[PDB]
């Protein structure tokens, strides 16, 4: 065997209330920037398909 350079200590990212991009008052992009993860439009389709509009709002 041989150990790959990918690990678990790098690739995890989380956020509670981080820096906000004050151009649009939207949460910033970046793991070291304390950035949140991105919803896609296909995932908006997935949330309309369940009809869960309260969680969608």
């Amino acid at each position: 065997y041989q150990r790959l350079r990918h690990m678990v200590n790098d690739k995890f990212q989380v956020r509670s209330t981080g820096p906000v991009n004050s151009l649009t008052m939207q949460p910033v992009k970046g793991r070291k920037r304390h950035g949140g993860i991105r919803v896609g439009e296909m995932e908006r389709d997935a949330l309309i398909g369940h009809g869960t509009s309260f969680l969608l709002q």
């Binding site: 065997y1 150990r3 350079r5 690990m7």
Partner: protein, 286 residues
């Protein structure tokens, strides 16, 4: 263009290729792939071509597929027939492998394009310039080493193993068929027992292994660097491990593996490690 083409037997590695976005493009050479960086002294090549019975193109006034055009790497010399053209091609390879004429290097790429219906336009081309991909094979009428390029590969026979050399079927054979692989492809044990996308995954996961970067690690100021403490030589290893010097850089370590569904955790590519193995240095990372 992304597709693998069968003219690459010996030059590019069919196994070592990344996946995702550069998939199919970003090839890799073989370990017997020399990139010539020199104008080989082929100035005496047209003189010995005139010795071989070629009329000058100044005194010819002809151009057609029935007359084999004899050129040197972008410079027309003369006009012959095709039978004498292939005689001159193979005889010039014979004079290439054997050192009979001093004004003729070992690495002259002799492409005989024969008259074939709906092929490329015929002629005898000689390549002796820079940046020519060269590879050695074994040559049978003199039983020595022969430098061959890719433009002459299609029109000439290159065998695999000596015991299946048949009568007037090949003139060339490999020293070892494992010459057709790359440097990292040969370092995967028993590559011809596996489904080839798993060989491609192996030859791409080998380039991300947190192992041995060097031993001068107290003098460098690299940005990010990774050291593995425990390094071991594989017992199941190829001879090119000994040859090309991966011995200075141990990447991983041997282990005892039971192929078993005992845990219940190993489903769809999972794997389980003994805890005392971790507690006694199972590849400590830095």
């Amino acid at each position: 263009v992304r597709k693998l083409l069968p003219e690459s037997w010996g030059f590019l590695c069919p196994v070592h290729t990344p996946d995702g976005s550069p998939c199919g493009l970003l090839n890799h050479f073989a370990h017997k792939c020399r990139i010539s960086t020199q104008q080989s002294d082929v100035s005496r090549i047209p003189s010995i071509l005139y010795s071989l019975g070629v009329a000058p193109a100044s005194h010819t006034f002809a151009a057609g597929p029935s007359l084999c055009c004899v050129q040197i790497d972008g410079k027309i010399i003369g006009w012959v027939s095709h039978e004498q053209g292939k005689i001159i091609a193979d005889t010039l390879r014979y004079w290439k492998v054997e050192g009979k004429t001093p004004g003729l290097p070992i690495d002259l790429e002799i492409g005989y394009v024969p008259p074939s219906t709906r092929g490329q336009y015929p002629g005898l081309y000689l390549f002796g310039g820079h940046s020519r991909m060269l590879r050695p094979v074994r040559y049978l009428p003199l039983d020595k080493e022969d430098i061959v390029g890719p433009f002459e590969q299609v029109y000439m026979n290159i065998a695999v193993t000596p015991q299946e050399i048949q009568n007037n079927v090949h003139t060339h054979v490999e020293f070892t068929p494992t010459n057709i692989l790359s440097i990292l492809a040969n370092l995967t044990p028993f590559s011809d027992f596996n489904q080839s996308p798993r060989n491609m995954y192996q030859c791409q996961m080998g380039k991300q292994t947190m192992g041995t970067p060097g031993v001068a690690l107290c003098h460098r100021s690299d940005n990010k660097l990774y050291r593995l403490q425990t390094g071991q030589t594989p017992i199941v290893k190829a001879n090119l491990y000994d040859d090309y010097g991966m011995d200075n850089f141990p990447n991983g370590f041997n282990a005892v593996v039971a192929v078993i569904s005992y845990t219940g955790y190993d489903m769809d590519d999972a794997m389980i490690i003994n805890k005392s193995a971790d507690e006694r240095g199972f590849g400590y990372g830095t």
